[PDB]
Design a binder for this molecule. Structure first.
Ligand code: MN
Ligand code: MN
Lengths: 582, 288, 421, 7
């Protein structure tokens, strides 16, 4: 290479424009390469250490850069040269930059022979750990676990000291820092200390004055528990997690709840039925609706994980009592959360109990105002149909299904239409006919085109789920009656149903009573109804045999081409160059 | 040639604007069509009549999900397609694009905002550069706006305009007489038609807007009976409901921009006039 | 027993003819007491540094920067004034200083840092590059730069009147006439509303937030005062919304009663065990345990009590005075008219009354406690009520956090008074 | 109220 271009990149590092400055930072390998490896060590490094003063982007890159510079500096024997600049950057106010520096520090720590690692890298951690600036001290929290193993016990002794120190730091920043690295730290400590050190402090932070600090602890809970033998729990872990669930901060408690099952599956089925149930009970009855909601949206999976022996017993002696409440709750997000899974219970209490214990509730929910709630009560059918009577239900969601089928808020209506195809097969064909057919036929004459369009496309999927025969029974008779509706909208709705019912109803019925209409509609006064018939053919064309396609299909289409309506010509002449009847 | 529009529309439907090249040409095909239209465009029903859209494009999408998609459903828009919203460009182009494609399925009238002086101060102007770098696509439009029809007559019974009535206008022939191919004046009948508002204080009042006038029920009753009309169908003024009858059903206001400017929080509405001129209203909220 | 207050410095117009932009609107010492900041009607910020119980060196200009600039809403014929309403410092993160400044609609986090060196060594300083050279950092004359690092915008419908940082070193709140929002010092695109008292139908508007502060130590506590004269202590732990376990501080009439019952400022004592409040005629201390009545009530200028009418006629009844505590929550300061400011010792119970005036006193001159007469009679070395300049109000004052140093702002000038140590 | 040229 020629030097000019590199000379430029170097100068660029000290230039006004931030993008140029950012560019050279990104070509640092090519600068270090061009310099020696000893000049990189004696020239480029000193320079990059001073600075540590610009904007995120630049600093953030400089930090990431220095993380991949071990060989460029001269292999592991000099990886410690990299420390001054990374140390500097770890002091910066920007926590996104500090984050990188630490990340890089950890990376290159694994280039430190237990010697260096102990001769330089650990002094680093302590200088940071004991630094005047809380920024510095915050970054120390994340350098412990990467060098705990590879050092002498005298050292490990020290590291354990500093950490406990950082854990009692005057600044909530550091304390937070600490309580968050606790997890990855205990994971490198020998169970002795993990019970003598990690526990007392996971206990203190988890009971800090700073809400911010407490929830951070409660996270480590899980990581901590899975580093101790099941016996120890009740005395080391559970005392803390006990008060956490009783925490004054609705946020902390909320954490407990959202992390409930992750806890149980780490606290053992014993301690679960032991302590968690009395707790979980307190949550489902928490004053803060946000907590209750979180809880109620767990009740299902929490129960599917109780030891077989006690399970069915608590589910009905410990849980049920609280759910009877969570149904008549004032907060509709709570109720909405419950009803969305309250049904995953039956496949745990069997028929009888599901009929005298879950039905009175499952019923009381279904008849709730909030459309969101009763909307969930319908989403989870199969969920409980495989364990009880479809009719013992079909006599409860009578209005529920109707009510939603005709809510002022058309969105609500679109909501239930989405589910009729499923609610259908799960209620026989006759029930739909002698009940849910009146409603599925009312939507097709709905004011809102979206509901009409969504009730149309719904028919198709209401035959692939009921046989192309049932379509001729209690379906097309009406779809043809709409061709008589005095409104071209409600009328066009008829052609739209055909354009869809042809796709799945057999050429028999299709060319039977469905094609006779489309032809007759071609004489409709409203052009919007006329070109929508010329379109119905270019669509349904193929499904029909080349036989009928010649008979009266082209005669009409060639007639429409001869309409005085601009838009009717096009969809009749452009409708032929698609049916081969061109 | 058709090939492009079908596409242009499909593209604009996804909210993907057009090129200064494309626009400048669409505005051309548009002009030629719109001059062949009368100041009182004749429109046969059925038609879903719509009011103010003001660039709230996503809502214009929500409107089609309420009344239906074009050209399946005949549409009559009463002006104010640009300004206020953040998508005036994509909005006004979709519609002007549809008008050229389906000349007999859509009718676009002129709103008080489809003028130069206003588009500048109210957003369509800045938006234009902010999307093109130059004020050329704004000039091609403000120009096309001139050729827009001032009013419309549905079934020879329903009078549709953006603004309202004028003291210097009494019969439909007065309007047809007018020369609309010019910027919106600050005063005069043309101006009034696009600025007037109907209040509940008799006769002609001083428009608190600065342009046009305020007319009370008595004035409407006269105009309607004098021109054999059943109703005056207009927009221009936000109504919390989306639509609102006044002057004992002689006049009806239809606003089609829900939660105007994402601030005013109000309903939007369209009015369906069926095969036999039977009217129905559809109130919708802003698409989520 | 009384602090011997002495004149130390003056900053500003050597005379009268006050330039509007220059009128100071906020004054705040930093956590250490070394830095003293002010905020302009002109949107500027001036930081002063103490030359190097303890120190009593002069405060000299350390950094000046334009914090806010005007903004318009041409369609609404609206200008959002660049005036700096408040400044609140952040606790020392590292080598740099950080402060929050706000106007009616936008809060900005500023970084003030020192720089004593610069790079030297340009390779290209015509393609005669024989060698490559890396720049070296050489010592330069100290330089202080200020830069905005975070712009928290668009969260407020009404006028921002308060910004208070949480003890958590992480979040802070800002308040309108009707809303308080919670912010994270590093997230600028989202703000959580923790209080909203805006009536559904603005016509039924009956009360307005007036001030608001976080507890000095309790991460979950804050209070806000209203035009109605009522402080409300809130527990963010009690609920996600912060309305439960809410403690209203009230005291057991006339049209005026209401006007002078509006609280202009609220300040937690340093100990966080009490909180001072200020309304038109009085400063009154409250015990956080007792919310049925204050513990102390001091009268700042009772001679105006009879003047409520005139003061109402010329708007001064609406002037909003700020009040503050001395580090040890033992003495308490606030201001009045005719560049007079009061000081009450919660122990002694003795109160002083002083004047902020250049041509009246000079360097290290002990200040001469003032006195005011009735609406008719005059007296010896006292000033009559009917001779007070109600245009020379003192709304912004500040107290060093650990010394008997004091920043008093007059319309144009900024005075620094301290005792002899 | 967005500015009486029209909320
Ligand atoms: Mn208008
Ligand atoms: Mn309008």
């Amino acid at each position: 290479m020629s030097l000019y271009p590199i000379a430029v990149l170097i100068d660029e590092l000290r230039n006004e424009d931030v993008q140029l400055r950012l560019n050279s930072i990104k070509k640092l390998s090519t600068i270090a390469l061009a310099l020696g490896v000893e000049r990189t060590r004696s020239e480029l490094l000193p320079f990059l250490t001073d600075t540590i003063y610009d904007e995120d982007e630049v600093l953030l890159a400089l930090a990431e850069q220095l993380g991949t510079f071990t060989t460029l500096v001269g292999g592991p024997e000099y990886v410690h040269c990299l420390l001054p600049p990374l140390e500097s950057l770890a002091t910066v106010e920007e926590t996104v930059v500090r984050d990188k520096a630490v990340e890089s520090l950890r990376a290159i720590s694994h280039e430190h022979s237990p010697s260096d690692l102990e001769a330089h890298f650990v002094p680093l951690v302590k200088r940071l750990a004991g630094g005047d600036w809380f920024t510095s001290r915050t970054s120390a929290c994340g350098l412990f676990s990467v060098c705990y193993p590879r050092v002498s016990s005298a050292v490990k002794a020290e590291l354990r000291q500093y950490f406990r120190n950082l854990c009692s730091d005057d600044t909530p920043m550091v304390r937070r820092a600490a309580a968050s690295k606790l997890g990855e730290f205990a994971k490198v400590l020998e169970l002795d200390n993990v019970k003598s050190e990690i526990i007392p402090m996971f206990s203190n932070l988890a009971s800090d004055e700073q809400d911010s600090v407490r929830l951070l602890a409660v996270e480590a809970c899980v990581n901590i528990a899975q580093l101790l033998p099941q016996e120890d729990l009740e005395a080391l872990v559970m005392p803390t997690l006990r008060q956490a669930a009783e925490d004054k901060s609705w946020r902390v408690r909320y954490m407990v709840a959202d992390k409930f099952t992750e806890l149980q599956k780490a606290v053992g089925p014993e301690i679960t039925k032991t302590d968690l149930v009395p707790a979980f009970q307190n949550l489902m009855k928490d004053c803060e609706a946000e907590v209750r909601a979180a809880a109620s949206h767990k009740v299902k999976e929490f129960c599917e994980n109780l030891s077989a022996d006690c399970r069915e017993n608590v589910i009905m002696s410990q849980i049920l009592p609280c759910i009877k409440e969570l149904v008549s709750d004032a907060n509709q997000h709570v109720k909405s959360a419950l009803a969305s899974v309250i049904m995953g219970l039956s496949p745990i209490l069997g028929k009888d109990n599901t009929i005298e214990h879950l039905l009175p509730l499952f019923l009381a929910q279904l008849k709730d105002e909030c459309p969101e709630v009763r909307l969930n009560i319908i989403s989870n059918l199969d969920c409980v149909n495989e364990v009880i009577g479809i009719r013992q239900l079909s006599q409860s969601l009578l209005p529920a299904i109707v009510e939603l089928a005709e809510d002022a808020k058309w969105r609500v209506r679109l909501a239930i239409i989405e589910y009729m195809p499923l609610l259908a097969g799960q209620l026989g064909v006759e029930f739909f006919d002698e009940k849910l057919n009146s409603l599925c036929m009312a939507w097709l004459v709905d004011h809102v085109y979206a509901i009409r369009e969504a009730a149309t496309s719904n028919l198709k999927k209401l035959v692939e789920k009921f046989g192309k025969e049932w379509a001729h029974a209690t379906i097309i008779p009406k779809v043809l009656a709409m061709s008589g509706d005095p409104n071209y909208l409600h009328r066009m709705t008829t052609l739209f149903c055909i354009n869809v019912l042809s796709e799945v109803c057999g050429q028999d019925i299709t060319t039977k009573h469905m094609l006779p209409t489309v032809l007759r509609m071609a004489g409709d006064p409203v052009a919007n109804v006329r070109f929508n018939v010329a379109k119905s053919l270019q669509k349904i064309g193929p499904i029909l045999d080349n036989s009928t396609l010649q008979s009266e299909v082209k005669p009409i289409l060639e007639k429409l081409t001869q309409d005085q309506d601009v838009d009717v010509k096009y969809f009749a002449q452009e409708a032929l160059t698609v049916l081969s009847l061109a | 040639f058709t090939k492009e529009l079908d596409q242009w529309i499909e593209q604009l439907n996804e909210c993907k604007q057009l090129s200064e090249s494309q626009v400048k040409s669409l505005c051309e095909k548009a002009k030629e069509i719109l001059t062949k239209e009368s100041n009182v465009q004749e429109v046969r029903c059925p038609v879903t009549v719509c009011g103010d859209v003001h660039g709230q494009f996503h809502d214009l999408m929500e409107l089609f999900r309420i009344g239906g998609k074009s050209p399946d459903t005949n549409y009559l828009f009463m002006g104010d397609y640009v300004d206020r919203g953040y998508y005036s460009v994509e909005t006004v182009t979709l519609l002007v694009a549809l008008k050229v494609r389906y000349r007999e399925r859509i009718t676009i009238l002129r709103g008080n905002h489809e003028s130069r002086q206003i588009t500048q101060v109210y957003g369509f102007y800045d938006e234009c550069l902010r999307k093109y770098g130059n004020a050329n696509v704004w000039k091609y439009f403000t120009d096309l706006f001139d050729y827009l029809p001032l009013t419309a007559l549905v079934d020879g019974q329903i009078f549709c305009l953006h603004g309202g009535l004028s003291p210097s206008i009494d019969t439909l022939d007065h309007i047809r007489a007018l020369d609309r191919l010019q910027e919106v004046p600050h005063e005069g009948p043309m101006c009034d038609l696009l600025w007037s508002d109907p209040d509940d204080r008799g006769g002609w009042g001083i428009s608190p807007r600065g342009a046009g006038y305020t007319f009370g029920q008595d004035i409407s009753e006269t105009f309607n009976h004098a021109n054999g009309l059943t109703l005056v169908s207009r927009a221009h003024q936000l109504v919390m409901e989306g639509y609102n009858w006044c002057h004992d059903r002689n006049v009806v206001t239809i606003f089609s921009a829900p939660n105007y400017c994402y601030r005013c929080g109000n309903q939007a509405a369209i009015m369906e006039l069926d095969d036999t001129l039977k009217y129905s209203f559809l109130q919708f909220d802003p698409a989520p | 027993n009384d602090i011997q207050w002495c004149f130390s410095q003056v900053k500003g117009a050597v005379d009268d003819d006050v330039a509007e932009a220059d009128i100071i609107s906020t004054v705040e010492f930093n956590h250490s007491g070394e830095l003293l900041a002010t905020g302009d009607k002109g949107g500027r910020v001036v930081i002063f540094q103490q030359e190097q119980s303890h120190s009593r060196g002069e405060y000299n200009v350390y950094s000046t920067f334009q914090s806010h600039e005007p903004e318009f809403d041409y369609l609404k014929s609206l200008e959002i004034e660049e005036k700096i309403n408040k400044i609140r410092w952040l606790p020392q993160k590292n080598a740099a200083q950080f402060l929050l400044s706000t106007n009616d609609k936008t809060i900005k986090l500023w970084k003030i840092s020192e720089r004593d060196k610069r790079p030297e060594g340009y390779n290209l300083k015509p393609t005669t590059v024989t060698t490559l050279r890396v720049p070296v950092f050489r010592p330069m004359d100290l330089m202080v730069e200020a830069s905005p690092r975070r712009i928290f915008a668009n969260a407020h419908t009404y006028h921002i009147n308060s910004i208070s940082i949480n003890s958590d070193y992480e979040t802070y709140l800002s308040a309108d006439d009707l809303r308080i929002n919670l912010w994270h010092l590093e997230i600028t695109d989202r703000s959580f509303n923790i209080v909203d008292i805006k009536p559904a139908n603005m016509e039924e508007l009956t009360e307005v937030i007036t001030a608001a502060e976080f507890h000095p130590n309790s991460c979950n506590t804050f209070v806000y005062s209203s035009s109605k004269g009522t402080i409300r202590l809130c527990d963010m732990r009690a609920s996600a919304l912060c309305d439960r376990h809410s403690k209203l501080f009230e005291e057991p009439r006339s049209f005026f009663s209401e006007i002078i019952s509006s609280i202009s400022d609220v300040k937690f004592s340093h100990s966080g065990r009490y909180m001072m409040t200020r309304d038109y005629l009085s400063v009154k201390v409250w015990d956080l345990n007792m919310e049925n009545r204050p513990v102390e009530t001091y009268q700042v200028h009772e001679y105006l009590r009879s003047k409520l009418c005139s003061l109402y006629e010329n708007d001064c009844i609406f002037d909003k005075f700020e009040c503050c505590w001395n580090g040890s929550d033992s003495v308490v300061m606030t201001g009045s008219y005719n560049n007079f400011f009061r000081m009450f010792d919660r122990n002694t119970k003795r109160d002083i009354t002083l004047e902020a005036s250049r041509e009246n006193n000079k360097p290290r001159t002990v200040l001469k406690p003032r006195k005011v007469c009735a609406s008719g009679k005059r007296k010896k070395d006292e000033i009559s009520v009917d001779s007070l300049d109600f245009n020379k109000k003192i709304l912004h004052t500040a107290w060093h956090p650990k010394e008997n140093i004091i920043a008093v702002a007059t319309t144009n000038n900024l005075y620094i008074f301290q005792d002899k140590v | 109220x967005l500015x009486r040229x029209x909320x």
